[PDB]
Every structure is written in structure tokens, then in C-alpha cells.
Amino acid sequence: NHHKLIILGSGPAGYTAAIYAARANLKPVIITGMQDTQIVYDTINAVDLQNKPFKLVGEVEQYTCDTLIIATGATAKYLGLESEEKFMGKGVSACATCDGFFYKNKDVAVVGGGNTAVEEALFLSNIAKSVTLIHRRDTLRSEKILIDKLMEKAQHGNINIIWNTTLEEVLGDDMGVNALRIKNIKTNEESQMGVAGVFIAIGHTPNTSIFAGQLEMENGYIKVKSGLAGDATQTNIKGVFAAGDVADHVYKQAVTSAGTGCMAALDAEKYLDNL
Amino acid sequence: NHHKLIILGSGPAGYTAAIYAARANLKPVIITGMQFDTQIVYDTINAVDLQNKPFKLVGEVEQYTCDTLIIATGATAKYLGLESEEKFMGKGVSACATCDGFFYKNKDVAVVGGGNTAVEEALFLSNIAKSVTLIHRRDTLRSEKILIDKLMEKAQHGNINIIWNTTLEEVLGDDMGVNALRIKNIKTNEESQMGVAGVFIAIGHTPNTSIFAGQLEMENGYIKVKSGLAGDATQTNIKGVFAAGDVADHVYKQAVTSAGTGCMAALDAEKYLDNLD
Amino acid sequence: ANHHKLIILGSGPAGYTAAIYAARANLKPVIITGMQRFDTQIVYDTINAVDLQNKPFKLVGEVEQYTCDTLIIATGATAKYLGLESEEKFMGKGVSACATCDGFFYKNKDVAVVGGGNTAVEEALFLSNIAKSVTLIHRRDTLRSEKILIDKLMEKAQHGNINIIWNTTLEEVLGDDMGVNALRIKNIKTNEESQMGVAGVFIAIGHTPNTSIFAGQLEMENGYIKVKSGLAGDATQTNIKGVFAAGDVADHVYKQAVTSAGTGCMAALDAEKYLDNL
Amino acid sequence: MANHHKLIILGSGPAGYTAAIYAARANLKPVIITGDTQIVYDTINAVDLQNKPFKLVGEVEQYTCDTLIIATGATAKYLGLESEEKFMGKGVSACATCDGFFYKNKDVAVVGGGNTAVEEALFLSNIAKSVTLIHRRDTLRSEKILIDKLMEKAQHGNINIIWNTTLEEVLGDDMGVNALRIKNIKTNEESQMGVAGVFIAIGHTPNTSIFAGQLEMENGYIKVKSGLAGDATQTNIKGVFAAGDVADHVYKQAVTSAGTGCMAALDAEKYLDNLD
Ligand SMILES: [Cl-]
Ligand SMILES: [Cl-]
Ligand SMILES: [Cl-]
Ligand SMILES: [Cl-]
Ligand SMILES: [Cl-]
Ligand SMILES: [Cl-]
């Protein structure tokens, strides 16, 4: 179906872009990966931005639009273990805010040491019985205020931190994951702990492979005009805008993504007015 | 007293910059002219010296020093203090068409600007004035399409005239009031003179940045920032001095966009502080 | 000394329009603004205290003191993001006035919004997509916002994560070094107090009137200076004869440049009549 | 069908025009009936506001609406002399900006002492050979800036001011007015001066006779709620609002009328939002 404006993503950028687009009565459509404003649950696997209108190819439906706001965020990197692929959506996940509610009063683990890992551990503490953060280094690379919150819960709450350790194998059966094999990288001593689910939070790349060859990109990030003269979210293709983490490899905060999401909606409004 | 980070302002940008700075345990100080912690100082900075380290800020009686400065003084509509106004106030020069526009019934007036405010004032004055001449420095108008269409309809079939790529150089008049304007085409540099009974300045919210004149690179009162995709997007021409919110944004001007750059400024400042000693 | 027949406080459409009309009546008005024949004088100063109990009225500036026979208050209204109660101790750690600034830090947490205007409703709606639950707290029995937004709010209150507590005010924000964890509220009609658990509170009152210096001397309601209004003249007069108020300081409904200009004009004409009969 | 509208505004002075702007900004597609904005030139001679929708009767067409903004202003007041009615549109007028151009290089008079009289005398000075302002009091009840303009022209221009005097009779013949009989109210001495035309500018009464019996009124002015709680322009009938000089007998400035016109549009918007 055809729409004046389609927004890809539902993080702070996508959501803020929809609010502003809706306030301008553009009747935006948000297409978000399965897991006024109209919300469509679909996953775009291909796009054609060389002609007007722009074409988006979903699982079964095809969409067309006059303007496109890309706010797909980032997607988790995986360790690459066979037991990781093998237990996907069955004890292995890379999105605590997606699947974390299924582990109420259960023991879970988080693998990583950046902001994503710390934020996921903190988010899972309010749901899980216990949260075990596993990281290969001796220190964490996150904001100080979040580290202090984490350490407070590690000393007096339901969080355990295992330093200088890597995930060797995810163990489980037909019903799902039930254990993890870990190894201390400094001592090479292996252990085995019981876990109902593990959350991989080790690194994030922008979700932009489908735009390869059509949009100017650098290290996977969609290039935007930026600047102080307006049209700051516009890509090399007029009418195609990018906001949030897909076009920001420095700040990566919900508030900065919300800001560019707003900008994208206003940029799109101006493009539609002059069509 | 000396501080690692001082934030000037009290809007979404200043507030968001303080939150992030506080989360990084920088103990930020917010100096506002209103009258993991944050300190709030109620004072008005009337002068600054950003040429040496540390930066100096001059308040009403007390002086402050800092290693980094986040300018987020915002923008506010001015109704008083426009050029040539004091001599011609309510007698030819105004910034409020809905205030004294009614005194120009069957008279020729001008409106200076190209945003929503300028277009709306020109449209409002058309129902009163004999003719309305909209004067703008750019080639296009930065307003909603519905308002542009209304304006163009009156320009084609009404009493509205549009002079593009032009700026107001001087307001000419005498004891009884304004009677002419000196204008200049910014592309050709050719100056002209048109007869007008009154002029209406419609630029909207202007940035609060007069104290930084001569030290920070500015354009139309807005503090220039690096912007871009390689970090330090809120940095001014002086390293360690950052600007966020409406003082450095003349396009979007939303609370959420100001909050975004405020956050960016705090993170840019954090990086500058980490690499100092 | 620094005496004037008419002094106007403010720099918005009301103050400006009041000056024009006062000047046209040759009252030689003085506009005192806190920024930085038939004439108007502009003084750049900030009034921090006033004494309106005697004639002439006294205004205290940074260094100069002024006296006047009539006073037109047109100080407007501005959004405050800083200086809310209990904020200084809990800033960016439980107390805020900008949901779009730090709302994202309350994902899957219980939060509250204080207010009943467009700002409060919009912040509650914005926070619903982030927070576990949003509790809107308002002192009145009805909401003073656009109907389309009220319907959105009520839809989420009936089928979503929004709860509404009417006829209630925030008495105290409770918490510790790590942040806010509770709120003390009071029902203004029954005076019964309660205590609810909250991870963060968002104060959403909008543009508030700049009138704290007139507390105790001028009749006010929710910070707005009460004016006589009506159809019999002296519509901008406060409880003190010779003291008038115009613009957003005395209007919590329309808040347009043209409506403020109208009352600013009215204030100048009301002041002119007061001066003629002195 | 097509004769029905969500909002109809009666009048085109500052109140009516400001109400239309705001109504249009709220996408109400307002219609202005004056005697995305639509302008209709018609005169309403009867209204029925007792039922929904409200009915308005024009010269030939009938209109219906969900909300009504009355901003009909005021119309010139006349002394009530027989010779005044008798020379209407033939030497007697109450609108200098209407008929003043027909007295180029002729002697004219203006009767009154308020802003209207002063402004008409000043307007007529640029056209007429001479302008004689006649007023019953010793001083003028107008803005000081306008009085100074008038007095400057009275001392160095073509304006003459006759104080403490009233118009007793308008004298003329088949071709029109040619003289006026005036009397000094303090001395009772009468005089006779030659004039080609006289302009009555003594006051303005509200244009509201068609609303008699349906809307609460006082001395012809439509009563409005006023106040500080909103709906300040609402009459005794919900959905019917009044703005400008029709509901203001004190201030009467273009800017005050513009203000209430804005208020009326916002009040009407709220009434329409809650209709369903
Ligand atoms: Cl000047
Ligand atoms: Cl510009
Ligand atoms: Cl410049
Ligand atoms: Cl002020
Ligand atoms: Cl002083
Ligand atoms: Cl005639």
C-alpha cells in the first residue's frame, strides 16, 4: 500500500519522528520488525530508492512512499558459537527489552562490558531472580552513573559479576537453554553455571545492509548532510532521511536519537510541501 | 570560584547538558539569569574572556572560572531594543503587527523577515494597510506551505509585494515618524530607497549572544558550531567552548532538538576534560 | 527623585502596546524590562521587590529605586525548567520538568506527571510509551487541554498504563542519595494525604506567570494576577487601585500576542483614567 | 447542504477579521458575512438561534451554522434633527472616508469631539478647502497625539474649531446642503456659516437590532460572559459568541476588538470540539 511517509524503526528516533509527522497531519506509517499514527509489524528485506515512489519489500507485502525516514537503529553482534545459533529464541537473545519479560523469577546471564551489557543487566535485575554479568575484561566501558548503579546491585542485590571470562558454549536441550560453559581468559580454568537464558550484549552494528549500493555509507552508518542549514537528516537521495543510531556513531543516546528523529520528520515535511 | 564545567542557560539544552554532565560526575554548575549532583547559581553573566585558560565569566559582582563552557542561553522574541526603534518606537518602528498595525490604515508599510512570523504579520497587515511590502534576505521563505500559498495569493491579486535577496540597512524618518527605508540587495550590493509609513521587524526569537561578540564565530547572532558526524559537533571556534539549543540552531527550534544538542555538548565537554592534564 | 506617573513592567506585546497607548496620551511611560513629546523611556533593570501599600508605589531594582502613581504589570509567563521544589537535591535523578529530556531513563519504571494542561497531558502520553506506568496528578477536577489529547489520555487510562489522580497536589518528593523513590500527595478537597512509590516525577505546569514578587500584596490564583475584567471598564485593575495587569500574567486561557496587546491597551486606558481623577 | 458551515462570522472590522484568521488557522473554514477563509457580501435581516443549527436569513439565501461569531461593530449615531434626515446622502454623511472625496476644494464641517470627529476632520483636511470642527464642549475627548495633530492644522492649516456649539439645523435646497445654523450653548447666540457638506461624527451605537429577544443585551450591546475562566465571548446562548464593539462600550480600539475576535475564534473552536 502507498503512503506519503514511512518510518523504519521504533526506537526513540522512529517514535519521535512519528509524533512530529503526526502533528503535521502526515499520517505516518511505522514499519517495525516483529518481536494519528499507523503501526505495521513487518521486516523489510529489500528496497528500491532509484525511482519515485520508493519501494519497500516486506515478508509478503510491498509498500511505496513519497518520503522515507530510516531509523532502524543497530543490531546485535553474536559471538559466532554454534550453540548460540542453535538456541536462538529458546534461551539465547540479544535484546533484553524484547524477551526479558519471559524470565521472571529465573536465573539469567548477560555477556558483554559496554553500555548495552550494563543497561541490559540493570533492566533484567527488576525482572529476573538473579543476573550474572560475564565480561572478558577487568573493567566495564560504560557511563559512571550506570556503573555505580550496577555495583550497588552487585554488592546488595541480585547481580553477580564474573570478570576476565568468555562464553565457550551454550548448553541446553529440547525445552531450551539450561547452562553455560565459561572460561577465565587469564587462568584458562573452565566452569559451568546454571542459567535459564543468556543475553548477548557485546557489540552493535547499524542495521543498514539492505541500503548498500543506493545510500552513501561509511562503516555501515548512513551518511546524512548534518549541518546548520536544515535538511540535516537527508541522505544522498532527496526524500530519504536517516535519524538515530543508523547515522550517529558518536553520541548514541536516546535523547540524541529523539532529536534527529524530530529533525527527520520536519525535513520530510518540507520535502512533501515542495513536491 | 573555579569549576571544571559551567553551563549557561535554563532551557531544555542547559538542563539536559547538566543531567549528562552530572551522570559523568563532572559536578556541573548551571548559571541562570532567572532568580552525581548539579549546582545551580542564580546570577547574570554580563561579560566573558574566552581567550585564555581558564575561561573567565563576569557576574553581577562575582567572577567565575572554568575549564569548559556550555553556552545554552536560548532565544527569545524581542519587542524592545531593535535598531532605530528607541527614536521611532510606536511611530514607524515595531515588532508587533497585532499591537500597532491598526495605526497604518490606508498607508504603505513594510515587513522584514522570511519565517512564519513575517508571513503571518504581512497577511495580518494586508487587511489594514494600503500596501504591504515583505522584505527578506533569502530567495525563498522558511514558512509553512499553507501560509506561503496565502501570501502568494495576496501578492498576485492583493496589496502584497515581495522584495527578495534584500536587507534593511537603515530606517529613515524625522520627529513626526518614519517615512523611508534604505535597503541593499545582498547579491548585487546595490542600494535603494522606498517610501514607507512604518516598518515591522519580524525575525522571531533571536539568540541571546551579544556578550560573545568578537570572541565566538557567529552568523546572524547564532553561535556557529562544528556540527558534523565526527564528534565535537557542539564545539565553537574555541576549543573547550560548546554551544547547544536555540543559540546554535535557527531551523528546528524544538525542546527535543535542544535536549539532543545539550546532551551532545555534555559528552563533547567530558571528552575535552578527559584529555586536558 | 526617580518618580514617574506611569511605569510598565515587561517587554511582551502587552507591555509594548501599553507603552504605545500611554505615550499617545502623553503620560511619558517608562518601561522597565529585565532583558539586556509622546515619547517612551526604556530602562533595563530587574525589579526584585515592590511596596504597593503606600502612594507612591515603590519598585526596587538592582541599584536604583523607582516610584510611580500607576503601575502596569505585564511581566508575561515563561517555562521554568530549573528551580522547582526538591529539584536541586534530586535534579536528573528523580525530579524533572522535561519528559523529552530525561524520560528515556525511566524505561519499565513507575513515574508521575504533575499538571493538567497540554504540557502535562503530552508528557504523560510521551512517557506511556517508555514507562511501566504513568500516574498523572492534577489539582483540579477537569483537564485544561485540547479535546483530541484528552481523548488519547483517557483511552490509555482505560486500556493502558496511565492512572489519573484528580483534585490532588504534590506536597513533598521523598528519596535518598541514589534518587527519588516516593511522593507525598494531598487531596485538596478532603485534606487526606497519601504516599505512592515512584522512580521519578515530571513537573508539567507549562509557561508560569512571573509574579512571585507580588505575593501578599496582589490577589492571585495559581500565580496569575487577578484582574476585575468585565464590561464596565477598569478591566485590568487588580485589588489595589492604580495597579493594573495585562497579558499572560493575568490570562491563563488565550495567551496570544493579539490578546495580550488588547489587555495592554486596556491597561494604559485604565491607568489614564486613574491619573485623570488623582 | 452547501449553505451549512461550522462557523459563520458576522462583520469584517478588526474583530471579525482576527476571528477569521484564527478560525482558519484551526482549519474551521470560516465564512465571513459582511454588509482558507470565504468572504460573502450579504446582509442578515433575521436570525433563529433557538435551534441547532442556527439559522441566518440573508437578502436571498439562508445559511445554517454550528457556531456564530457576531462582530457587526457599530454604526454612526445621528443628532436626530429633521434637516439631518432630510439631507442624507446630499450634504449630510457620517462617513468621511466614504463620501469625503466628493468635497475636493469645498468647505465642509464635522460635528463631534471624540476620536471619530478628530480623525474625520484630519482626513478631510487633505481633501477639502477648509474643515470646520464643531463641538459642544470646551475640550476634545480623544487621544492627545491626535488632538496635537488637529491643533497644529487649526493654527497653521485649513482647520477651524468652533467650541461650545451645537448644530441646530442643516440648511439647503434641491441641489443639496449649503449652510448650517449653529448655537453657542453657553451664550445662546446663534450664527450661520456656509458649508457644502456636513459630517456627523458624534458616537457609535451597536448594530444588533436583529438579535433582540434572543440574546441578552444592555443598551444595544450584546452581553458576553467575560471573565478569566475562558468562554469570555460567549452570549447567553451556547455556541453564539460576540466580539469587538458590539460587546464593548468602554475601550473601543481596533487592538481590543482584535483581541476579543481572537478570543471568539478560540471559544468557538472549543465548542466545536465538544459537539461530536
Ligand atoms: Cl537605536
Ligand atoms: Cl535565514
Ligand atoms: Cl552576522
Ligand atoms: Cl520583563
Ligand atoms: Cl540598577
Ligand atoms: Cl453626501
PDB file of N, CA and C in Angstrom, chain A residues 87 90-91 107 170-180 192-198:
ATOM      1  N   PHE A  87      20.440 -22.246  19.921  1.00  0.00           N
ATOM      2  CA  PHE A  87      19.464 -21.880  20.938  1.00  0.00           C
ATOM      3  C   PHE A  87      18.788 -20.495  20.781  1.00  0.00           C
ATOM      4  N   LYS A  90      15.239 -19.317  22.227  1.00  0.00           N
ATOM      5  CA  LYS A  90      14.953 -20.511  23.004  1.00  0.00           C
ATOM      6  C   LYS A  90      15.902 -20.574  24.206  1.00  0.00           C
ATOM      7  N   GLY A  91      16.417 -19.406  24.610  1.00  0.00           N
ATOM      8  CA  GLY A  91      17.373 -19.267  25.723  1.00  0.00           C
ATOM      9  C   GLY A  91      18.506 -18.279  25.380  1.00  0.00           C
ATOM     10  N   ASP A 107      17.002 -17.387  36.571  1.00  0.00           N
ATOM     11  CA  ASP A 107      18.412 -17.007  36.555  1.00  0.00           C
ATOM     12  C   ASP A 107      18.840 -16.766  35.120  1.00  0.00           C
ATOM     13  N   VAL A 170      27.022 -22.671  24.908  1.00  0.00           N
ATOM     14  CA  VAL A 170      25.686 -22.536  25.490  1.00  0.00           C
ATOM     15  C   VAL A 170      25.114 -23.949  25.513  1.00  0.00           C
ATOM     16  N   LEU A 171      24.858 -24.468  26.709  1.00  0.00           N
ATOM     17  CA  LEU A 171      24.341 -25.827  26.883  1.00  0.00           C
ATOM     18  C   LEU A 171      22.833 -25.823  27.116  1.00  0.00           C
ATOM     19  N   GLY A 172      22.146 -26.803  26.529  1.00  0.00           N
ATOM     20  CA  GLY A 172      20.703 -26.914  26.677  1.00  0.00           C
ATOM     21  C   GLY A 172      20.134 -28.184  26.075  1.00  0.00           C
ATOM     22  N   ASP A 173      18.804 -28.234  25.977  1.00  0.00           N
ATOM     23  CA  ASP A 173      18.089 -29.388  25.418  1.00  0.00           C
ATOM     24  C   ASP A 173      16.844 -28.936  24.625  1.00  0.00           C
ATOM     25  N   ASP A 174      15.952 -29.883  24.321  1.00  0.00           N
ATOM     26  CA  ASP A 174      14.718 -29.596  23.567  1.00  0.00           C
ATOM     27  C   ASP A 174      13.864 -28.456  24.125  1.00  0.00           C
ATOM     28  N   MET A 175      13.788 -28.336  25.447  1.00  0.00           N
ATOM     29  CA  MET A 175      12.988 -27.265  26.082  1.00  0.00           C
ATOM     30  C   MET A 175      13.691 -25.902  26.075  1.00  0.00           C
ATOM     31  N   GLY A 176      15.015 -25.895  25.901  1.00  0.00           N
ATOM     32  CA  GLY A 176      15.778 -24.632  25.838  1.00  0.00           C
ATOM     33  C   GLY A 176      17.144 -24.685  26.520  1.00  0.00           C
ATOM     34  N   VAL A 177      17.703 -23.509  26.771  1.00  0.00           N
ATOM     35  CA  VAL A 177      18.981 -23.363  27.450  1.00  0.00           C
ATOM     36  C   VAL A 177      18.806 -23.642  28.944  1.00  0.00           C
ATOM     37  N   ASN A 178      19.820 -24.274  29.545  1.00  0.00           N
ATOM     38  CA  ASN A 178      19.803 -24.583  30.982  1.00  0.00           C
ATOM     39  C   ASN A 178      21.183 -24.429  31.660  1.00  0.00           C
ATOM     40  N   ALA A 179      22.225 -24.116  30.880  1.00  0.00           N
ATOM     41  CA  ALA A 179      23.584 -23.958  31.423  1.00  0.00           C
ATOM     42  C   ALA A 179      24.552 -23.294  30.430  1.00  0.00           C
ATOM     43  N   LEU A 180      25.678 -22.802  30.948  1.00  0.00           N
ATOM     44  CA  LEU A 180      26.712 -22.146  30.141  1.00  0.00           C
ATOM     45  C   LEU A 180      28.106 -22.624  30.527  1.00  0.00           C
ATOM     46  N   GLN A 192      31.055 -24.094  34.966  1.00  0.00           N
ATOM     47  CA  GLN A 192      29.726 -24.347  34.394  1.00  0.00           C
ATOM     48  C   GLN A 192      28.663 -23.885  35.389  1.00  0.00           C
ATOM     49  N   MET A 193      27.849 -22.922  34.964  1.00  0.00           N
ATOM     50  CA  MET A 193      26.796 -22.348  35.800  1.00  0.00           C
ATOM     51  C   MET A 193      25.439 -22.575  35.159  1.00  0.00           C
ATOM     52  N   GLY A 194      24.413 -22.713  35.996  1.00  0.00           N
ATOM     53  CA  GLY A 194      23.043 -22.937  35.525  1.00  0.00           C
ATOM     54  C   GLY A 194      22.376 -21.618  35.188  1.00  0.00           C
ATOM     55  N   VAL A 195      21.775 -21.543  34.005  1.00  0.00           N
ATOM     56  CA  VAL A 195      21.099 -20.334  33.517  1.00  0.00           C
ATOM     57  C   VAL A 195      19.885 -20.721  32.674  1.00  0.00           C
ATOM     58  N   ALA A 196      18.784 -19.998  32.829  1.00  0.00           N
ATOM     59  CA  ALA A 196      17.558 -20.257  32.043  1.00  0.00           C
ATOM     60  C   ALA A 196      17.637 -19.555  30.669  1.00  0.00           C
ATOM     61  N   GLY A 197      18.408 -18.473  30.606  1.00  0.00           N
ATOM     62  CA  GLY A 197      18.568 -17.710  29.375  1.00  0.00           C
ATOM     63  C   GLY A 197      19.781 -16.803  29.417  1.00  0.00           C
ATOM     64  N   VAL A 198      20.412 -16.619  28.259  1.00  0.00           N
ATOM     65  CA  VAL A 198      21.601 -15.768  28.153  1.00  0.00           C
ATOM     66  C   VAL A 198      21.322 -14.637  27.163  1.00  0.00           C
TER      67      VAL A 198
END
